[PDB]
Amino acid sequence: MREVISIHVGQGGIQVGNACWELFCLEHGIQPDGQMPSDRTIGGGDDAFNTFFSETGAGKHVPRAVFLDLEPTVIDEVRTGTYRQLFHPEQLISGKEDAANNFARGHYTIGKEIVDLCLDRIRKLADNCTGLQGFLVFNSVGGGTGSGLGSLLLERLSVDYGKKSKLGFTIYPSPQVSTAVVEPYNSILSTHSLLEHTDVAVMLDNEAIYDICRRNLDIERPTYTNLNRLIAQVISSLTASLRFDGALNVDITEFQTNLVPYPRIHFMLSSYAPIISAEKAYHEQLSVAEITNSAFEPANMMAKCDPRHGKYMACSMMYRGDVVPKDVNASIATIKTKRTIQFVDWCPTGFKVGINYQPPTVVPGGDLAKVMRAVCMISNSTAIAEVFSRLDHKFDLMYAKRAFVHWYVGEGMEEGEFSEAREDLAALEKDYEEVGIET
Amino acid sequence: MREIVHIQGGQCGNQIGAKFWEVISDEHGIDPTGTYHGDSDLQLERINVYYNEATGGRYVPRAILMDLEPGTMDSVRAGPFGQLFRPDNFVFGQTGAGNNWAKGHYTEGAELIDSVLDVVRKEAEGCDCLQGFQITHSLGGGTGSGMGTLLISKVREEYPDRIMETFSVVPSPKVSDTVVEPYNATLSVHQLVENADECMVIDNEALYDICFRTLKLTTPTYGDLNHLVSAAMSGVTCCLRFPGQLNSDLRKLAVNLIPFPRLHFFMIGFAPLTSRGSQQYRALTVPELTQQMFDAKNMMCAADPRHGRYLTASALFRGRMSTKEVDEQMLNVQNKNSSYFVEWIPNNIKSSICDIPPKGLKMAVTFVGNSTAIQEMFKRVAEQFTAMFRRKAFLHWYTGEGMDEMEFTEAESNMNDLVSEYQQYQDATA
Amino acid sequence: MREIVHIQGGQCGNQIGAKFWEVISDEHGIDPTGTYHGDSDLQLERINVYYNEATGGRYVPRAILMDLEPGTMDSVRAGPFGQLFRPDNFVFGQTGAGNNWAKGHYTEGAELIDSVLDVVRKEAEGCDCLQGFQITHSLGGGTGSGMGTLLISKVREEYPDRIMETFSVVPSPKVSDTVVEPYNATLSVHQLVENADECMVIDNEALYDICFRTLKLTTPTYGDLNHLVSAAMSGVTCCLRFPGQLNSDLRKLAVNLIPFPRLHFFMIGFAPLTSRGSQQYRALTVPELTQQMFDAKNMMCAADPRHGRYLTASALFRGRMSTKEVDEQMLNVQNKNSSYFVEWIPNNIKSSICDIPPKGLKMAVTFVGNSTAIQEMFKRVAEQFTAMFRRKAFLHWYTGEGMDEMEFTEAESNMNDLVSEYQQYQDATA
Amino acid sequence: CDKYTSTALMGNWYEERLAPNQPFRENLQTKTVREEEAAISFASDLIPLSRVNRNLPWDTKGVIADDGFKEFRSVNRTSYDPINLNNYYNLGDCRQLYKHYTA
Amino acid sequence: YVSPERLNDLELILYEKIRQKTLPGEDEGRTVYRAFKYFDIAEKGVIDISQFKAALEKFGCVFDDKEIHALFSKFDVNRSGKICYDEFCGNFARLGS
Ligand SMILES: Nc1nc2c(ncn2[C@@H]2O[C@H](COP(=O)(O)OP(=O)(O)OP(=O)(O)O)[C@@H](O)[C@H]2O)c(=O)[nH]1
Ligand SMILES: Nc1nc2c(ncn2[C@@H]2O[C@H](COP(=O)(O)OP(=O)(O)O)[C@@H](O)[C@H]2O)c(=O)[nH]1
Ligand SMILES: Nc1nc2c(ncn2[C@@H]2O[C@H](COP(=O)(O)OP(=O)(O)O)[C@@H](O)[C@H]2O)c(=O)[nH]1
Ligand SMILES: [Mg+2]
C-alpha cells in the first residue's frame, strides 16, 4: 500500500540503478524475467514487494522506475542485458543527442523536448499508485544531462505534485580524483536549482568509496560496479523499514522532522558498516558495539569530508538483523561520552533509532560476506561547508578569465546566471558558519 | 544514430582515407566484398555510424572522394578494398591543380565544387541524425589545401551547428617536397581558423621519427604512416561505436578542450607502439600506457611538447580496466609534471573508457592534447613566408588568376595574431 | 471492360509502338506467337483491355498501324514480336509525305484516311464498353504530324465523350534533323490543342540526356529511347489492368490534373534508373523513389520545372508498400518546396497504389506533372517559326496544296495565346 | 640492413629477420593489379577514366599485431552474468555424504 | 492435429508482420535474425519450442501451442527438435524478396 517512485537520469544515475534493481529483485526472490518462482512461497513475504514492484495480474512483477538519458548507449544496453524482460518497454526513455558535458544544452535547448514524455510517465505511475510516499532521484551533477535534465525535472515535479517528499542521492566531484575539466561550472549551477526544490540530499562522491574498497575489501583494482553495489546497499538499508517488520519502524517522513533543523540546511552525508570481505569476516567478533563504533570512524565515511572539523546536528541509526534495543542504547551512550565526537549546543538529543529484523542480503558474485548485523548512518553536520568551499575556489579561479563561457552563452544561457549561482552558495556557505556558533 | 560522413581530398587525403577505410572495415569484420563476416554481435549494433546498407546485405561506406586529377582515384579503385566505395561518390576534373592554391580555390575548384556539394548534401540528408564531418587532406598542395577548404567553407555555411574535424598534414622544413609550400599553407591556415571546430596537425617528419625510433623498422613507407594516422583516427571515435563506462562523443571533446573559440589546434598520439622484436617482453598495464602516452617523442608533430604548457588534454582508454588506476595515474602525471600544465585551470585532463579494444589487442589509448607548443609550427611557416614574400618570388602565378597581394597581406597578419594570442597564455599568470 | 484501342502513326510512332507492345506482351507473359505462357492468374484476369480473342486461344492487340511509306511497316513486321499484329490492321500509303504538313494533311491524308477511319470505327464498335484512345506520333515529321492529327480531329468529332491521349515527340533546337520542322510543329500544336484531351510532351534531347547521364552507357540507340518511352506508357495505365490499394484510371487522372480545359500539356518521368555497375550499390526505397521522381534532370522534356510553378501533380506506385510512407513522402515533398507550387490550389498532388511491380523490379513509379514551365518550348518553337516566316522561306511547298497564309497566322496567334494563358495563370495570386 | 643484404651482423640486423615477406620488394617486375576493367561507372568525364596497372600493396601491419586476445566483451555483460544468480538458486547444502553424480 | 493448406496461410500472416516491423533499409531476414538472437542465450544456433513460441509472440502473432508444433515441424526437417534459425531467416528473406 505504501511505495516510492525512483528516478534515474544521466549516465551515472542509470549505472547505479543497475545495481540497486539487481538487489531489490534478489531480496524478494524475483527472477530477472519477472516471474516469482513460487517454490512454496505461500506469501512468505506476502505483501512486501509493493514498495518496489507491482503485480501485473498474472505472474510477473514490474518495477516502479523510469530511466532517462539523452544518449542511447546506456539505455540500449539495458534493453539487451540480462534484465531485458523486466522493465517496462516504454519506461526506458532514450534521447537522441547527448548533452556533451554542458549545463545549458540539457536545460534550455534539448532538455525541454523530453520532459513532457517523462512527466506523462510519472503521472501514469502515480495514478496506479495508491499510497505514494515520495520520490528518490539518482543523478550525477558533474555532468551535462544529469545536472541539466535533473534540475528541470525537479522544478516541474515540485509544481505538479507539491508537498511530496524528495530525496536526492547526488554525486559531486572529488577534491582531486575526477573525470571532466569543466565540471565546476555544471556543479555550481545545479546546486542553485536543487537547493530550494529537494528536501534531503546525500553526498556520494567517488574518491571516498575508493578508499573504502581498498582499506576494507583489499581490492586494488576496483571499477564502477563495485562502487554501485555499495551505494545500492545503502538504499536498501535506508528503505528496509518501509517494507519489513521491525521493533522501531521509521518511514521516509520521519527524516525531515528528525534531520532538518532549518529549511536551507538539508545537505547530509552517509556511512555504512560493517564492510568486510569473506576471508576476514569469521575471525572477528562483529559485535553491535563494534559496528556502531566503526560507523563513526572518520575514514569510514562515504564522503570526502572530515567530521572533526565541524559539529553535529542530527544523526539517524538504521539497524537490521538480530540487534537488541538494550544493546543499542548502551553503545550510543558511549558515543556521547567521548569528547572527540562533539555535538552542537542547541541539540541536546541527536539520535533517531530504527530497528529491523531483516538481515542484510548478499548478492552472488559480490565482495561482501554474509553477516547477521548491519547499520546505516546519515549525519547532518556543519563540516559539509568544506566541500562547498573548494567548489567555490575552483569556480572563481577559472571564471576570472571567462574560460569555457562561450560554450554556455551560445546555447541559451545568459551570462548573468553565473553570478547568481555564486551569490547563493556564498549565502549558503555562511549559513552553516552562522549556525555553528554557540549561544 | 548520430552518424558521421567522410570527405577526403588530394593525393595524401585519398591515401589516408583508403587506409582508414581498410582499417575500419577490418575492425568491423567487413570483407573486401562488403559482406559481413564478423565474430561478435557488437560489430553490427552501431555499424550504421560508418556504413550504409543496401539490397543484398552489403555495406557501402559513406565517403566522398574528390580530386582535380584522375590519377589517384584510379589507384584507390585498383588497390585492395577499392570496391567498397560507391561509383557515384567519385568526382573529378581533368587538369589538376599543380600545387597552386588559386587554381584549386578560384578557377578550377569553384567550377567543380557544385557536383561534390550536391553529393555531400544528398548523403547528409540521407542519414537520420547527422553528427558531424571529418576531413583528411594536406595543406602543402594545390587541390587539397584549396578545394578542400573551399568545400569546408561552403558546408560550414550550410550546416552551422554540426561539429567539423580536420586531419591536416602540415608541411615541415626537415622533409620538403615542394618549393612553394609557405604560400598555400599560410592561406589555408588563415581560411581554416574561422570554420574548423577541431584541427589535428600531422607532420611526415614526426611519423618518420616514430618509425625509426619506436617501431625500429629499417624501410617503412607511406603505407605505415598512413596506417598510424588511420589507427589514431579510428581510436578517436571508439566510444561513438562501442559501449563503455564513460561515453564521450566528438562534442564532449570540444567542450573539454576548447577554452576560447580561436584555440582549437591539437596534437595527437597513439599507444602502445612496440617493435616486432620486443613484443612479448612487456607487460600490459595502465602505467605503461600512460608512460608511453606522455612521451615527448610519441607525438605526431615535430614541435616539442615540453617547450610549452598544456591548456587541456584528453585520453580515450579502450578495453576492460579498473577506473581507479586511470584517475590515479592522471593525478600522478598532473602532479609530478605541474610545470607543464597551466595553473589557472584545475584538473585539465579528461579520461574516457571504452570496452572494446582494437582487434588482437587488450589495451589501447588515443591521446588528444591542446598545448602552447603548436605555435612553433606556425612560427616557422610564417618565417619562411615573409622571407619568400619580400622578394615577391613565385607570385605571378597567383596574381595571374584573380588573386591580389592584399589577400597575402591579410593572411600573414592573421597568422601573427593567432600565434600571439595563442602564446600569451604561456606567460600570463593569474 | 473499359478497354482502350491503340493508334500509332509515322515512323516514330511505329517504332514507339513496336517496343511498347513488346513490353506489354512481356508484362502479361505472351510469347511472340500469341500463346499465353504466364504464371499467375492476375496476368490473365484483365487481358481484354489490350488483347482480343482469336483462334487457338491466341491474343492479338487492338492496335492500328498507319503510315504513307511501306518501309517502316516492312521493318516492324520482321522485327521482334512482329507476329502479334493482325494483317488487316496494316494501312499503307504508296507515295509518302516528304516532311510536308500540307501533303500529309490535305491531299494524300484525306484520300487515304477513309480506310483507317473505317478500321478504327469497327474496332471501337467491337468492344462492349470503350474507355478511350491513345496515339503515339512525332510532331516534326510530315505524315505523322498531318494525318495523325486529322484522324484525331475526325475521331473527336465522331466520339465526343471519350478521352484522348497523345504521346507526342516534338523537336528541339539542339538535336535537329529537319529544316522545315517549325512550320508543321506549330501547325500540329495548334491542331492538337483543339482535340487532344491530354498531351504528354516527349523530347529526344531529354531522352539522350537521360541515357548519357543516368544509365551511363556509351553508345545509345533509338531502341533505348523507345524502351524508356514504352516503360512510361506501360506505367501510366497499370492500375486499370491490375488491382491495387487505390484504383485510378485515365479519366480520374485527367480530372485531378486539368484545372482548365486549355491546360493539358503534361511532362512525365520514370524511376528508378540505374547503370549496370551501380545496381548493387543502391537500396530501393520510397524516399529514393520520390527523390528521383521530382528531379529536374529525370524528366522527359527540355523544359526545366524549377523555372515555373506546378499546377497539379500525379504519382502512380507499383509494388507492395505502406500507404503512410507514401502519404508522408508526398506531404514532405510538398512542404519542403512551397516556392515551386502555386498557392491557390492546396493539396495539388495525387497518389495511387498498385500491387504488381514490373518484371525485374520490386517497386516502380510513374510521374505525370502539369507545369507552367512547359511554355518555354512553345516560345522557342514560335520564335524559330516567326524568324523563318518573316522571309516566307520554304512557303511555296506549303502553298502549293491550297493552304494560305491565314492558317499560318491563326496558328501562330493561337500558340501565342496559349503561351500567354500559361504565363497569366503562373503569375496569379489569391 | 646497413648497406648490406642481411645475413651479416651489421647495424640493425636482428629486427629485419622477422619481416614477414614483403612481396613488393623482390617482385618489381609483375606490376599487374589490373582488376578495374572498363567499368564505365566510376566514371565518365563519354570516356571512362584511364587505368594504369598499379603495383603491389606493400604488406603493412605497422600497428602491433594480434596477441591472441579475441576480447569482444562488455564490463556490464560480464559483471552480472546470470550464472551467478543461477548458482545462488536451485543449489546449495551439498557436502557429498554419499557419492552421487552431479552436473 | 491439423495440417490443411493452413500452414501456408499462417506463414503468409507471419511474413506480413515482419515486413510491418522491419526497420528502414533492411530485409526481413535480418529483422527475424535479430529476434531469434535476442531470445536465444546458449548462442549455439538452435532453440526449443517455447523460445520459438515467444519469438512468434513478440511479433504479435498469438496462437495455441498446437499449431506452434505444426509450424515448428514444418521448419524442423530433421525431427531433431532443434531449429537452425539461419535457414529460417534465409528462407524468409527469399520469400520476402
Ligand atoms: N560512482 C560512479 N560515478 C559515475 C558513474 N557513472 C558516471 N559517474 C559520474 O558521472 C560524471 C560524469 O558524468 P557522466 O555520468 O559521464 O554523464 P552524465 O552525468 O549523464 O552527463 P552527460 O555527459 O551529458 O551524459 C563522472 O565524473 C562520474 O563521477 C558510476 O557508474 N559510478
Ligand atoms: N604521411 C603521408 N603524407 C603524404 C602521403 N602522400 C602524400 N603525402 C604528402 O603530401 C604532400 C604533397 O601534397 P599534394 O599531393 O601535392 O597535395 P595536392 O596537390 O593538393 O593533392 C607531400 O609533401 C607528402 O609529404 C601519404 O601517403 N602519407
Ligand atoms: N525518340 C525517338 N525519336 C525518333 C524515333 N524515330 C524517329 N525519331 C525522330 O523523328 C524525326 C523524324 O520523324 P519522321 O520519321 O519523319 O516522322 P513521320 O514523317 O511522321 O514518320 C527524327 O528527327 C528523329 O529524331 C524513335 O524511335 N524514337
Ligand atoms: Mg549521457
Annotate C369-408 with DSSP letters as a single string.
EEEGGGHHHHHHHHHHHHHHHTTTTTHHHHHTTT--HHHH
Subunits adjacent to chain E (3 or more Cβ pairs under 8 Å): B, C
Question: Which of chain D's residues have a Cβ under 8 Å away from the Cβ of C215?
Answer: none
Residue with the three cell numbers 538487489: A23
Closest C-alpha to ligand 2, atom 27:
B222
Question: Which ligand is in closest contact with the Cα of B12?
Answer: 2
Q: What are the backbone dihedrals phi and psi of residue B81, each rounded to the nearest 5 degrees, phi first?
A: 60, 20
Cα E42 to Cα B389, C346, E45: the distances in Å are 71, 58, 8
Contact D33 B273 (CB under 8 A): no
**All residues at 6 or more sequence positions from A278 whose CB lies less than 8 Å from its CB, including other chains:** A368, A369
B47, B55, B62, B127: best mutation site toward chain E, by most E Cβ within 10 Å?
B55
Interface of D with C (CB under 8 A): 39-42, 44, 46
Contacts of A387 (CB under 8 A, 6+ apart): A172, A175, A203, A205, A303, A304, A305
B376 is annotated as contributing to ligand binding: no
Q: Pick the atom of ligand 2 nearest to B68's CA.
A: 21
Q: What share of chain A is helix, strand, coil (3-state, %, to 5)?
A: 40, 15, 40
3-state secondary structure of C364: strand
Identify which of B8, B138, B177, B183 to mutate to test ligand 2's pocket (most ligand atoms within 8 A of the CB): B138
Question: How many Å apart are CA C426 and CA B260, to the nearest integer?
Answer: 52
The answer to whether C93 touches C174, Cβ cutoff 8 Å, is no
Centre a 10 Å sphere on the Cβ of residue B401 and count the other Cβ atoms it contains: 15
Q: Is A164 strand, coil or helix? A: coil
Give the CA-trace dihedral at A25, A26, A31, A34, to 10 degrees: -10
* Residue B378 amino acid letter: F
- Which residue from A97, A176, A221 is facing B331, i.e. has the nearest CB? A176
3-state secondary structure of E57: helix
Please report where in the chains the cell 587541456 appears, as a residue: B312
CA-only gyration radius of chain D, Å: 30
Across A103-199, where does the E strand assignment appear?
Answer: 132-138, 165-170
Q: Which residues of A are less than 8 Å from D82 in CB distance?
A: 32, 82
Question: What residues contact A151, with CB distance under 8 A and at least 6 apart?
Answer: A107, A189, A190, A193, A194
Coil vs helix vs strand at D22: coil
CB pairs under 8 A between A and B: 94
Residue of A176, A221, A404 with shortest CB distance to B259: A404
- Give the closest residue (by CA) to ligand 3 atom 21: C10
Alpha-carbon distances of A58 from A28, A36, A61, A62, rounded to whole Å: 17, 11, 9, 12
What is the distance in angstroms between the Cα of B120 and the nearest Cα belonging to chain E? 20
Domains by residue range for chain C, with CATH: 3-256 (3.40.50.1440), 265-374 (3.30.1330.20)
Q: What is the separation, in whole angstroms, between the first and last Cα of chain E?
A: 32
- CA distances for A141 relative to A11, A103, A146, A185, A406, angstroms: 11, 10, 6, 10, 20
How many CA atoms does the CB half-sphere of C3 hold within 13 Å?
20
Around C303, how many Cα atoms within 13 Å sit in the side-chain half-sphere?
Answer: 28
Distance from B25 to chain E by nearest Cα, in Å?
20
C130 forms beta bridges with: C3
- Pair B321, B371: CB distance under 8 Å: no
Rg of chain A over all Cα atoms, to the nearest angstrom = 21
Phi, psi of A427 (to 5 degrees): -65, -45
Q: Is A220 a catalytic residue?
A: no
Phi and psi at A118, nearest 5°, equal -65, -45
CB contact B360 to E (< 8 Å): no
Q: What is the largest CA-CA distance in chain E?
A: 40
Task: Kindly report the nearest CA distance between residue E25 and chain C, in angstroms.
Answer: 7
Calculate how far, in angstroms, residue A140's C-alpha sits from the geometric centre of ligand 1. 6
Closest-CA residue, ligand 1 atom 27, reads A179
Phi first, then psi: what are they for A316, rounded to 5°? -120, 130
For residue B356, the chain A residues in CB contact (below 8 A) are none
Rounded Cα distance between D43 and B112, Å, is 15
Contact of B275 with B214, CB cutoff 8 Å: yes
Ligand in closest contact with the CA of C66:
3
Atom of ligand 2 nearest to the CA of B204: 1
B57 at E interface, C-beta within 8 A: yes
Ligand approaching nearest to the C-alpha of C225: 3
Pocket perturbation via mutation, ligand 1, pick of A140, A171, A228 by most ligand atoms within 8 A of CB: A140
Of A222, A404, A407, the CB nearest to B322: A222
Query: To which residue does cell 553528427 refer?
Result: B131
The answer to whether B261 and B314 have CB atoms below 8 angstroms apart is no
Q: C-alpha grid cell for residue B395? A: 607570385
Are the beta carbons of A63 and A124 closer than 8 angstroms? no
Distance CA A349, CA B288 (A): 55
| A269 vs A98: CA distance, rounded Å | 30
In B241-285, alpha helices (H): 250-257
Instruction: Provide DSSP, A363-421.
Output: -TT-SS---SEEEEEEEEEGGGHHHHHHHHHHHHHHHTTTTT-HHHHTTT--THHHHHH
Experimental technique of record? cryo-EM
Measure the CA–CA gap between A392 and A402, rounded to whole angstroms. 15
Between CA C224 and CA C270 the distance in angstroms is 14
Beta strands B63-67 and B163-169 are unpaired
Burial class of residue B179, CB neighbours in 10 A (0-12, 13-18, 19+)? exposed
Q: Which atom of ligand 1 is nearest to the CA of A147?
A: 19
Out of A155, A207, A254, A290, pick the active-site residue: A254
Q: Give the torsion sign (CA, B416, B422, B426, B429).
A: positive
Beta-carbon contacts of residue C193 (< 8 Å; ≥ 6 apart):
C199, C262, C264, C414, C418
Residue C323's nearest CA partner among C246, C238, C271, C248 is C246
Please indicate whether chains A and C are in contact, defined as at least 3 beta carbon pairs under 8 Å.
no
DSSP three-state, residue A25: helix
Query: Which of E23, E30, E89 is best to mutate for the B interface (most B CBs within 10 A)?
Result: E30
Element of type H or E holding B367:
strand B364-371
Does the beta carbon of A184 lie inside 6 Å of ligand 1?
A: no
